[PDB]
Design a protein around this nucleic acid. Structure first.
Lengths: 107, 93, 83, 98, 93, 106, 79, 98
DNA sequence: ATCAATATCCACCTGCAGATTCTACCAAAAGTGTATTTGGAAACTGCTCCATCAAAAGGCATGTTCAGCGGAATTCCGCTGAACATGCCTTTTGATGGAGCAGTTTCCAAATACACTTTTGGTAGAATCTGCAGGTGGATATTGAT
DNA sequence: ATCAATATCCACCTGCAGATTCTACCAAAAGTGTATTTGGAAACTGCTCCATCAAAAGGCATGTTCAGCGGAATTCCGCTGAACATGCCTTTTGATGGAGCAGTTTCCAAATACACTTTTGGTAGAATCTGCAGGTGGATATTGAT
């Protein structure tokens, strides 16, 4: 008895995604491909961000990803930043960035 | 009991970075991320279906829904993993 | 067993600190009261909707999720006090 | 006199605070502000400790991002001192009263 | 058929300003408006159910949802109109 | 057979609103108290705009409302303007307004 | 080229409606680029709805729906 | 030898156009752009006449409001002439930029 | 203050594109009545977690002093937009094939609804594991005075 | 530009709160397997209405001339801020009574699910009506030169 996720090459629970799709009432019926496709996309997007997070955590000599890292990853990546342009990551701070005209000295 | 995608995110975390962890605070955020992205797509897909007088959201709705919601290249590599998990599922029966 | 006059607890020092995270270098002296004013309005809108979700569930305890759903309604999705 | 010129302690703070995440508003006083404002909406309320934390995280995030747009707005008038009219322009343009 | 609120917009239009009319493009705007407010109120009433794990979108929800969506006075009077119409219905055969 | 709309005392289709609610996939069950209320709420709001748009036209010596009149009525009321803050009414123009610091030196 | 179709005098009329008194010269090209980005974004989603319904004809509704999924809702074209 | 001073005609135009609702960009030119841009998303498309129009109404409706903010931006820097940096500013703060 | 060129208003006029009115057809509603089903209110209550009092202490706010320097006020003028009248190249308007947008029919792959069987992801809880906060000190800048 | 006062960087070090690791129960999931229902792709087609063309219409592209806007240089007043002394009130480690959220079981008022009938809001072709959009005329307010 193989899980549907394994049938599709995924890690994310197609079984779950599918169930949620129904209790959410997005429609009368739900394809059998929908759950797979979705789960696949979810899994991909969480792998993209984790990749960047992991990296951000490496640059700060840490082994365990914390809020701040998920933020550094998102805000430093053009697209992700757009996809989450109205999202607010708790305990994430902001990108270091001081306007040019505020720096001392000249030249 | 409250479900969370926590174990799944973890599995994937180990795939990209075998030697990296993630605090429970970060995991929570990831959880809000999977969930937030989920609703967003299903939603857009809900609307796509009514706009066309349709009763079942299929992988085709989900996709367009994903091309309208995500940005450039992200749409593209999402659409591929999409198509690819389906095509594989579809031959497993 | 007391009262209420809270937006002075929003100290000058704290408002400085937030201006810094914003990349601010020099602050006018009238910023402090203007900020306080802005913050209040903001809190009022969220708490207003927050408490609405509370009442509507016939509860007497504003939950994390209430604030979250309220924060979503106002285009400020907050990540993580529970999806 | 070993005294830093004005503008040198500022940049030091800017860098400092942008490097960290911890909340900038004294917790307790923020909590009373929440109970004060909420109470005048509906009395006899109780807040989960986590509810209040979210309202902070969210308020601080807002304000922080509000200053950036403000700061951008003063720099536009050729200044470095943010003034009320700056906060006011950003709020207008933003659709918070435009 | 292509339903629309045209015709109920005209019956109201006449109780307010009997002698007043309305061009085509203007009736089109008022149809778009009744749909906007419909979908908006509907949706929030939908969520209001889901958050509270309820399968029923009753009058109660519509209320709470009109309270979240409409601006102060506007909601005060919309909440009443609504309670009036529901009361007049229950108390009837 | 004397109706749902007439029963609740409305001009808006209580039956149509109820059929739109079911078929929009907003929930598994739709109490009967929902469409009525909602219907009543939609009517009220529509009366509200027409009232103001009806006046707007009078003020311009016209008996027929057009886009132009719904806009001057919506952007001149504090509340509605907020409710339709991100809405664009086609062929509505903009309210007359010139920044003071742009008027003549006098 | 078509972007130059949106002519200076048109742009001048737009701004006016916005209550602009005096206009720099570069404004004209800056306005063009912004109009393009606007359009591309809108038409992209519009055309996507089209290709979902399987047609070769952008419809009023596809545009409306696009203009909606942004907080640019439009009244007066069905929906 | 009659000449109106700079701004006296502008001010009358503002009055003129805030009073009318007619479209200000010429339809043909505009329709070519709509078609030109779309050709890049999908080849050989057709537009419903009411589709291109909904498109114009929205585009100018959009542009107008932006000049409004751009103007407030110039006024903010103590000018009466709007400049590129004004637009850019109103867009950054709106969120359309960064 | 006195014209002189224009722009704006207003009162009246009337052709017509757009709105109102009457008739007739009918699929799709929407109302009605019967039968079956069930969501979630009510009553009881386990147990989590919120309100709150207590006490100690140092982080941090408050308030004053004093000088650095930013920002508004002012004068100056280089040069960029704006007003205007000249000339026609492009848009606007109305007539016409045909590409599709839809309206209808057919029918099968695919989505319910239903009965079981089995694998799994929560979690309550006792116990071991380990990344990194935060205290410490010293090498390396970064500033400001000279 | 060399000096002195300080803040910043940064690798080492260790108590510990937060985390990675179980053994065990499991209700809720997810998967397996007919039986029944049907949403929507697919092929064919009529009626739109969208693309294209040619003639009639009127907005735009262009070069001169100069008002005046707005950036630069200069000045100084007063605000904002760095430094410092003092001590409050926020922060922290705990503990306790109990409000009130939340799990469980009961049970009916209301919602679903057909089936049969009546009405009705939408569409289509034809006829008739009208609100007001432009056009004209003459008065007069607005703006610019002297």
């Amino acid at each position: 008895a193989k899980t549907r996720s394994s049938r599709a090459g995924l890690q994310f629970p197609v079984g779950r995604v599918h169930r949620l799709l129904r209790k959410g009432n997005y429609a009368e019926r739900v394809g059998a491909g929908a759950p797979v496709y979705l789960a696949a996309v979810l899994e991909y997007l969480t792998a993209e961000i984790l990749e960047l997070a992991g990296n951000a955590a490496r640059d700060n000599k840490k082994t365990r990803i914390i809020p701040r890292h998920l933020q550094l990853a998102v805000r430093n990546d053009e697209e992700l930043n757009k996809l989450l342009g109205r999202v607010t990551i708790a305990q994430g701070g902001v990108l270091p960035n001081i306007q040019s005209v505020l720096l001392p000295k000249k030249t | 009991r409250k479900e969370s995608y926590a174990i799944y995110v973890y599995k994937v975390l180990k795939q990209v970075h075998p030697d990296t962890g993630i605090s429970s605070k970060a995991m929570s955020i990831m959880n809000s991320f999977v969930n937030d992205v989920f609703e967003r797509i299903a939603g857009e897909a809900s609307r796509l279906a009514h706009y066309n007088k349709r009763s079942t959201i299929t992988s085709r709705e989900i996709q367009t829904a994903v091309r309208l919601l995500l940005p450039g290249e992200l749409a593209k590599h999402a659409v591929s993993e999409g198509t690819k998990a389906v095509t594989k599922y579809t031959s497993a029966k | 067993k007391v009262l209420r006059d809270n937006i002075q607890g929003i100290t000058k020092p704290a408002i400085r600190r937030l201006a810094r995270r914003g990349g601010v270098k020099r602050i006018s002296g009238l910023i402090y009261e203007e900020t306080r004013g802005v913050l209040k309005v903001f809190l009022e809108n969220v708490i207003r909707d927050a408490v609405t979700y509370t009442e509507h569930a016939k509860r007497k305890t504003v939950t994390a999720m209430d604030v979250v759903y309220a924060l979503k309604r106002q285009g400020r999705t907050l990540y993580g006090f529970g999806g | 006199p070993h005294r830093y010129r004005p503008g040198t302690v500022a940049l030091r703070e800017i860098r400092r605070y942008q490097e960290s995440t911890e909340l900038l508003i004294r917790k307790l006083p923020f909590q009373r502000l929440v109970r004060e404002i909420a109470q005048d909406f509906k009395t006899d309320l109780r807040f989960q400790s986590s509810a209040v934390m979210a309202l902070q995280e969210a308020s601080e995030a807002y304000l922080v991002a509000l200053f950036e747009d403000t700061n951008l707005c003063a720099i536009h008038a050729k200044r470095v001192t943010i003034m009320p009219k700056d906060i006011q322009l950003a709020r207008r343009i933003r659709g918070e009263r435009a």
